[PDB]
């Protein structure tokens, strides 16, 4: 009971990191124009913050950070620096709303260096966050003493980052809960998905009092990336439907993912949360009898909350035009006769070149909107 009072499950902010973490994705090479498209779409979608690659990284990186701060977006624009006064100056000139100071223990000297940079940023009227890299493989007592010191100085947020992807949910819960007892400020969390824990860790972090979670569209990032944006929203929606459906424009998630999928040349995985081919499907037939209750009894995600029309009850392999129509009708693409013709021409010239895959259905449909 009492700890429910600290839970942030229906009162948190997303720090969208497709334009920071996502630039570490193996196939991400965003140009200025494509970053701007993504920033605008993220803002329309309803995230509170977007984070950008450090403006010290490169020239184009500094220019793009300046351009994005000039767009008039509703969400706040963040970036990050190393703990050097040099970098801080560059960052505050760009027009960002906040700066993360990142350090690694991954001792008395850290506290001193960190104070100069924190007060400089603060004096420029800018939000300041203080974070550690590889927080779960850093000495616990040193880490916490450091957060305590910077809390006494005054920052807006402190950050925990599982950079390596080894943290487990109850381990995260316990650390965040202790951090929540040590500091008086807000708490942001960043979780790598190497072992499948990035969404679970995000959730436990919120339960323990974290106020801000980093996400990435389709989870793109270093290695297999971080907490996916869509995946977190699916989880948080189950916890509080009315909060998530009103805060975000959930019916825009598919277009937002397709925009990134195009840029980084990937297919939306068949089992992607919400938007994957198979996410809103039930098996009909001899295999529906494999559970005791009717398949429709298990619909934790309501399809129309996410812009879709139904669960598809699959009893046979739908092939050709049949597969396209079903998926298109599920996605609310009201396809004209002329559109239906191209698709079955493209879908043929595809299957004739190579034996068709379930993923190809969504792939040939990408170019279409509701």
Binding residues for ligand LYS, per CB under 6 A?
A: 21, 100, 102, 131, 133, 159, 161, 163, 188, 190, 192, 290-291
Question: Residue 293 interacts with a second copy (CB under 8 A)?
Answer: yes
Contact 78, 15 (CB under 8 A): yes
Shortest distance, CB of residue 313 to Zn ion, whole angstroms?
17
Contact 347, 324 (CB under 8 A): yes
Segment contacting a second copy by CB under 8 A, of 33-41, 63-71, 249-257, 357-365: 357-365
Residues 17-56 that bind a second copy (CB under 8 A): 20-21, 23-29, 53-54
Residues 212-251 that bind a second copy (CB under 8 A): 218-220, 222-225, 228, 231-232, 234-235, 238
Shortest distance, CB of residue 201 to ligand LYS, whole angstroms?
12
**For this structure, is 212 an active site residue?**
no
Question: Residue 190 interacts with a second copy (CB under 8 A)?
Answer: no
User: Which residues contact residue 292 at a Cβ distance below 8 angstroms, ignoring those fewer than 6 apart?
Assistant: none
After which residues does the chain break, using C–N > 2.5 Å? Answer: 106
- Cα gap 354→348, rounded to integer Å: 10
Question: Residue 301 interacts with a second copy (CB under 8 A)?
Answer: yes
Shortest distance, CB of residue 106 to a second copy, whole angstroms?
6
Question: β-strand 98-103 against 186-191: which pairing, if any?
Answer: unpaired
123 assigned ligand-binding residue: no
Contact 219, 231 (CB under 8 A): yes
The encoded tokens of residue 239 equal 């916890």
- Beta partners for 159? 131, 188
Radius of gyration of the chain, Cα coordinates, nearest whole angstrom: 22
- Cα gap 131→161, rounded to integer Å: 7
Question: Residue 196 interacts with a second copy (CB under 8 A)?
Answer: yes
Using CB under 5 A, list all residues that contact Zn ion.
Answer: 21
Instruction: Enumerate the known binding-site residues.
Output: 20-21, 80, 100, 129, 131, 163, 190, 192
- Binding residues for L-lysine are 21, 100, 163
By annotation, the residues acting in catalysis are 287
């Amino acid at each position: 009971n009492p700890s429910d009072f600290l839970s942030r499950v229906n009162n948190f902010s997303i720090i969208e990191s497709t334009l920071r973490e996502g630039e570490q994705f193996a196939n991400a090479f965003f140009d200025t124009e494509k970053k701007i498209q993504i920033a605008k779409a993220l803002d329309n979608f309803g995230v509170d913050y977007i984070e950008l690659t450090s403006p010290v990284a490169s020239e184009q990186s500094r220019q793009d950070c300046e351009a994005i701060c000039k767009l008039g977006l509703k969400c706040k624009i963040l970036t990050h620096i190393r703990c050097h006064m040099d970098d801080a100056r560059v960052a505050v000139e760009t027009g960002v709303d906040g700066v993360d100071v990142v350090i690694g223990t991954s001792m008395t000297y850290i506290i001193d260096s960190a104070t100069e940079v924190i007060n400089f940023v603060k004096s420029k009227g800018i939000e300041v966050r203080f974070s550690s890299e590889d927080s779960f493989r850093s000495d616990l007592v040193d880490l916490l003493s450091l957060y305590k010191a910077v809390d006494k100085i005054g920052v807006n947020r402190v950050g925990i980052a599982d950079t390596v992807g080894c943290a487990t949910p109850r381990q995260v819960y316990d650390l965040i809960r202790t951090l929540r007892g040590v500091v008086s400020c807000d708490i942001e969390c960043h979780f790598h998905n190497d072992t499948g824990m990035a969404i679970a860790n995000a959730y436990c972090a919120l339960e323990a009092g974290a106020t801000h979670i980093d996400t990435s569209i389709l989870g793109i990032g270093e290695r297999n990336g971080i907490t996916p944006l869509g995946a977190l929203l699916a989880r948080m929606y189950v916890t509080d439907r009315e909060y998530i459906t009103h805060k975000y424009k959930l019916n825009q998630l598919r277009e937002l993912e397709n925009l990134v999928a195009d840029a980084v040349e990937v297919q939306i995985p068949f089992n992607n949360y919400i938007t994957g081919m198979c996410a809103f499907t039930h098996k009909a037939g001899i295999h529906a009898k494999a559970i005791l209750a009717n398949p429709s009894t298990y619909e934790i995600l309501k399809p129309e909350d996410f812009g879709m029309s139904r669960y598809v009850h699959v009893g046979s392999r739908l092939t050709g035009w049949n597969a396209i129509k079903s998926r298109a009708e599920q996605l609310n693409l009201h396809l004209t006769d002329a559109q239906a013709k191209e698709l079955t021409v493209r879908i043929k010239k595809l299957a004739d070149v190579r034996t068709l895959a379930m993923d190809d259905v969504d792939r040939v449909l990408r170019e279409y909107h509701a």
